[PDB]
Design an enzyme around this catalytic site. Structure first.
Site, short mmCIF file in Angstrom:
data_model
loop_
_atom_site.label_atom_id
_atom_site.label_comp_id
_atom_site.label_asym_id
_atom_site.label_seq_id
_atom_site.Cartn_x
_atom_site.Cartn_y
_atom_site.Cartn_z
N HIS A 123 -5.20 -1.01 -3.83
CA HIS A 123 -6.58 -1.34 -3.49
C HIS A 123 -7.55 -0.91 -4.59
O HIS A 123 -8.66 -0.46 -4.33
CB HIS A 123 -6.97 -0.72 -2.14
CG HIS A 123 -5.87 -0.78 -1.12
ND1 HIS A 123 -5.32 -1.96 -0.69
CD2 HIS A 123 -5.22 0.21 -0.46
CE1 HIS A 123 -4.37 -1.71 0.20
NE2 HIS A 123 -4.29 -0.40 0.36
N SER A 172 0.83 -1.20 0.00
CA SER A 172 0.00 0.00 0.00
C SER A 172 0.87 1.25 0.00
O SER A 172 1.51 1.57 -1.01
CB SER A 172 -0.95 -0.01 1.20
OG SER A 172 -1.91 1.03 1.10
#
EC number: 3.4.21.-
Lengths: 194, 194
Positions: free
Chosen positions: B148, B107
Site C-alpha cells: 500500500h 498485504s
C-alpha cells in the site's frame, strides 16, 4: 526491442547487458564537478566519451550509431535534463533506445529515463537549472527511480529518502533502488535485480 | 520450482499465476475482524478455506495437497505470523511452497514471505501478538515488501509509509509495492508487475 538497465549505482551485469565492448559514456550530469568509469572499464567495456554539452547533434547521432550501448552517468539530475533538453539530444537518445540501443542509467541517468525528475527535487537541487521548468522525463520507463534508497550515502541520508516518499509517493510510482540493485527492462518486462 | 506472486492488494494475473482452479485460502491475518475473496472468485478461482487457527497440521497437509495454490490474505501481519509460528503450519506451508506450490501473498501475506515482519511495525500493531518476539519471516524472498506504498489507503497514509522507510530503510531491503503492483518471482527471477 528496447532494453534498459536502470541502476542505482551500477551493477555487475552491465557488460553482459550491453552484449558488446563499446559504450558511449554521457558525463554531463557531473559536468559541474572517475570512479564510475572504472566500474564499466573493469568489466572490459570501452568507453567512447560523449559530452552532450560540447557535441553537435549530428555528431551525437552518428556516435550513438557506432557504439553497442549508451551509459548515462550520475550527477545533478536537473543539470542533466537541462542539457538533454537544450541540446535536443533527448530526442536522439530516446529514438535510438526505442530502436534497440541498450541504455544503462546510473543514479541521475536512471531518473531521467522515467516519467519525471521532479520526484528527486529533495535529493538533487533544482536550482542548478534555473530556466528549466518542465521536469518531464524521457519516458522510457513508467517507473520513477529513487536511487541510493538505503541512505548509506552521506549526501542522501535516509531522512531525505523518507522525505521523498512523503512529498512525492502519492502522485508518482516511486521505485526505490538501493546501491547494488537495478531494473533490467527487456522484452517489455521489468526484472528487479540484486 | 518455487513460484511466488507477492501482491500489495491482489493482481489480475492471479488466476494465470495459479495455473489451476483450486486455491487454499488462509484468512487468519484478518481473524480479529469479504472483498478479498471476491477478487479471487471473480477470476474463476475456487476457494478452499484454510483457517490455520482451527486446523490441525494433518488437515493442513491434505488440504494443501489437494489444491493448485495457496493464497495468504491481508490483515494483521503480527497476528498472522503468530498463528503461523504457534500452529507449526509455517514449516508445512514453506515446505510445500519450496516444493512448487504457487504462493499468492496479499498485504500481510506478502510481508510474512520476506526475511522479517519487523519493518511493518508502524503499519500493523505488534501489540496484537504480545508474546511474539521473533519477527523472522518465512524467508521465501529476500525482499521486505511494504504494501500500500502509495498512501491511497486511509488506514496507511503516506506519512506512515515514509516513517517506515526512515525507521527501517537502512537495515532492510524494503520493496515498496503500490496497490495494483506485484512481485512475480519464478525460476529464480523477480519480475515487478503493474
Amino acid at each position: 526491442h528496447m532494453r534498459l538497465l536502470l541502476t542505482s549505482f551500477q551493477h555487475p551485469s552491465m557488460a553482459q547487458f550491453i552484449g558488446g565492448k563499446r559504450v558511449a559514456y554521457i558525463p554531463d550530469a557531473a559536468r559541474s564537478y572517475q570512479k564510475e568509469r572504472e566500474g564499466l572499464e573493469k568489466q572490459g567495456l570501452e568507453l567512447i566519451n560523449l559530452p552532450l554539452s560540447h557535441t553537435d547533434l549530428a555528431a551525437v547521432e552518428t556516435t550513438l550509431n557506432a557504439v553497442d550501448g549508451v551509459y548515462v552517468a550520475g550527477g545533478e539530475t536537473f543539470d542533466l535534463l537541462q542539457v538533454l533538453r537544450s541540446t535536443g539530444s533527448d530526442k536522439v537518445i530516446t529514438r535510438r533506445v526505442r530502436q534497440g540501443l541498450p541504455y544503462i542509467g546510473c543514479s541521475a541517468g536512471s531518473v531521467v529515463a522515467g516519467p519525471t525528475i521532479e520526484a528527486v527535487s529533495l535529493m538533487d537541487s533544482p536550482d542548478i537549472a534555473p530556466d528549466l521548468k518542465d521536469y518531464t522525463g524521457l519516458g522510457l520507463t513508467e517507473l520513477a527511480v529513487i536511487p541510493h534508497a538505503s541512505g548509506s550515502i552521506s549526501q542522501f541520508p535516509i531522512e531525505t529518502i523518507a522525505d521523498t516518499v512523503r512529498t512525492y509517493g502519492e502522485r508518482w510510482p516511486l521505485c526505490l533502488l538501493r546501491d547494488g540493485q537495478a531494473l533490467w527492462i527487456e522484452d517489455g518486462e521489468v526484472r528487479l535485480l540484486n
